[PDB]
């Protein structure tokens, strides 16, 4: 609702990124000129005053700016607009500090009769880093470049603005010591070439500054020229202080790109796997043909990437089920094995559904072998070939885009009549037997639509009849299966349930386990409406069972006249 | 931390043994030894035995850090041979020092970093959108539930699956438990009910604007909103959707999708990251099959005698019509198993809750059955289950006549047995 | 607690209970199982199933550790197909302790 | 020299031989062995057993630097049955092959 709440900006908003990178750049200079403002002068020369006044109005503006702009509640993790909580958001944390940052310090000091406690207030300017942090912040998250690279980048950042605040707060205690004293300070016993740097407080500053910033990057890299040392006791122990800290920082930038080289990258990975294989190659004297399909092996392994989706497993399973039904579901309704099925349980199998990437030429299940996963060949051709006894592996065919197999494994589970190999690489939608099966027997009319599409497949060279006769018998059980359902639901009297499975499948009269159509035991309950759909249904009225009962016999039996006179009828 | 104390004391006690070998030379040849000889700027060391204290602590402490770090700056320096030796034992046992400092801190930075954890996902992630070509409408939502992942951390719990399935029950007992419990719709039921349920619950987050289960589809996962806050707008045939309930802590919706067997009739879209509860449609089902017991009164909270929705069942109702049903299905499936002649898988029912007794909508038992095709191991099974051997069926057919007439005289003898 | 096998699994291992205890807490209708023990170290599951070729009896788990040496299905097999006489050895001596391990009985 | 199969095993992994000789000693009840050397180069061992599901005839300790081509039993046996006619060829080519070598077993 930001129509209530208005005159506040999204912290995404535009106008504001500008200003953002435009605040970044000013708080970069005040956070580099404070250390040499603190330094270097005693107070701001005349020629360097209006900057100050500037970039305190900058900062002043940037504080308005953050009274006003939204930002997403880390708990809620939604971005709230109300003016009060962004002020209390605000004057809680990261107010006070900015705010005094933003003092003309420098004026304070100046009318102050000159003392320097004030001046030591300067320092607080330096958390206008914080914006650099923050900035830092963004471009890590940012996936464009490296998570590692940009903690070196930090770390570059830290130690340039390390080194020239040392460098700054270096000179500073050289002017501590008064200047009759100045040939005790480092600086002004300094005669670097014939140049004795005397009177030190009165050279230009960028001789000063590059000097004293020398001193600090020569520390930095720990090269201790020793042309630039220490001579006070209050230098010497700034000295260890840096010196320590120094230490420990640049001990963590080696290690971040110490991190950086052995994380590595796929293709390091890739190098280092094919010499181990150019190793293997080498001592067994291999065919170069053979070398290259080898080599393409592990090229198109790494170039080839879907280990993802087990990294997608985390993205929770609707939106798992909305990028398989994206992306899946368009090959699989041009599957013939689906094909006039009902699309929920082909949606079903689109969820359970596995890409994958068989080589070329690599077997996807061995001759006569119990399959676990029913694969879906998509967009490439397959070999399937099948070996006997007599152990002739002719191929029985290249099954070619949209096409299925493996579910001769699955739908009666017989061992794999053809092995499977590959011509080329292809897509495989692998699909596990037990997903299958249990979608099965959720939609047992489902499975006797597999089986359908069986029989539409049945004339063609779908299986040989001797495979496909196996399937048959497991065919001929399901039928059965429903024959009682359909038995037992007529002496229930739910009609929904007939009507549905009988147009579903099951429209002749099914004999049970006793040879019984529904038609007597619908005439025992008395049930006349049932009798009416099984006489629209041609079960024949004659049938006596194995055991020789009539429809008309028990119907006679029973006594439920109207259903005697229908059945007569 | 143990190291940079290491660090801190050997250099304390470098400085104090490097400036007490400057005082193992006589007071005379001080000029020989490293401070003795020390003109830092304009100040001379001269009596370098009579300085303040604290002036050559910080000078020989100066040494010893800038040494430590390796920065040789040369004002100071070893002269003598006792000191020269000492630095360079100090400074060989510096370099194996410092380089364990160096190696230790970068073996905790390659140990890795959550935000490298999520980096790596995150970018294989994109490069997975990018070669597998998906629409930006769903990419901003799989970088977004990345992001949440990163947000709640719950993914170490299901990074610790290797605990064993007791225990991860255990974890789902203490804390999906006391909310199965508290929502009332799924709350009256058996302990087995609530806790097997429990354990196939799975974590679920969602960012604000994200539509689970649309008005219209069919709901495969059972939510539950424990913490958080949903919205349940019934989408019209113009479009608008009018927010019949804010689903709160406490709500689950989806259960008409598995019980009713409708897809939802109003989408429910987030409006706040909710602790969501996956549960599958599929499994749902099956918990009320095997718990159709407690699925009467469970049913009697949700959907039969409940006003809150205003029906009772508008599907055919089962949670006791298939009940009845069930009594005599599962006897039709041992006697569909004694026609085949499944002896394992006949035990499987009995062992399920089959009664042997029971007759089919004709009569015949598995008895029956078992002895007129004639399975005489499938009978001997049932004989030790001590099946009425003189129960007939609507035919006047008893189980030793039903032998006779199919001619199986050895199902005979084990009937007269 | 680590349950390793439950009623209806196809058995591939034979498990010796070695030190530690073994719950084996046998399946009953009533969705809670049962409480029946097998027993602790000098044991043994699994056996039964593989010799007879049916899937697991009962479920079986670990009450508060068990060294079990597992024994592959083939390979027992071919042992009690090589040891004919000597595999008969076994159910012999199993329905001995059956009348005593209703366990098993 | 490292003795790798023992008398009266079960093998399911059959060795083929390639480089060095070897001894198929067939230990005697009396207490030494019947040190008949085991041909090696070209040659194998630890097959009979399962070529006709007898107890491993003869230990076998190799004598000199062995690299073997180790067979395992089940999926042998399993490309027997897939090329039948060829399996019985091999049974025999085996008897064929023993028929002059005169083993002993």
Redesign the interface.
Known sequence: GHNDYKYIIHPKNRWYKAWEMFILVWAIYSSLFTPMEFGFFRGLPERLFVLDIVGQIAFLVDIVLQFFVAYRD?????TVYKPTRIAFRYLKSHFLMDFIGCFPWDLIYKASGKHELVRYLLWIRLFRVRKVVEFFQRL??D?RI???FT?ILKLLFVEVYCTHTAACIFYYLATTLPPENE????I??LKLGDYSYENFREIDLWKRYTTALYFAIV?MA?????DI?????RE??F??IY??F???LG??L???I??LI??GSNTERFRDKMNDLISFMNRKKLGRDLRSQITGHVRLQYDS?????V??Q??????R???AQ??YLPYIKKVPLFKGCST?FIN?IV?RLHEEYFLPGEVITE??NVVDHLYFVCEGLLEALV?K???SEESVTLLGPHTSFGDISIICNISQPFTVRVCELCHLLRLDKQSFS?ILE?YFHDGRTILNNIMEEKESNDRIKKLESDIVIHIGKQE??LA?KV??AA??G?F?QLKSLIRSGADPNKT???G?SPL??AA?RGYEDITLFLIQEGVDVNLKDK?G?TPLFEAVKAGQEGVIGLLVK
């Open positions: 880390t708990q809620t993790y939604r890590e998250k996936t490296n998570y590692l903690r040939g005790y300070t480092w002004g016993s520390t720990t090269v201790g020229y020793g040392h220490a001579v006070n006791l010497m122990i000295v260890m010196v320590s120094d230490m420990v001990a963590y080696i290690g971040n110490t991190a052995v994380k990437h879907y280990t993802d989706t990294m997608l985390d993205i929770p399973a609707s939106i089920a909305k990028i994206l992306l929920e079903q969820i001759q006569g070996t006894t007599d152990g249990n959720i059965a299966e009682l038995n037992s002496f229930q739910d929904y049970d386990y006793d019984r007597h035991l025992c055991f009962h």
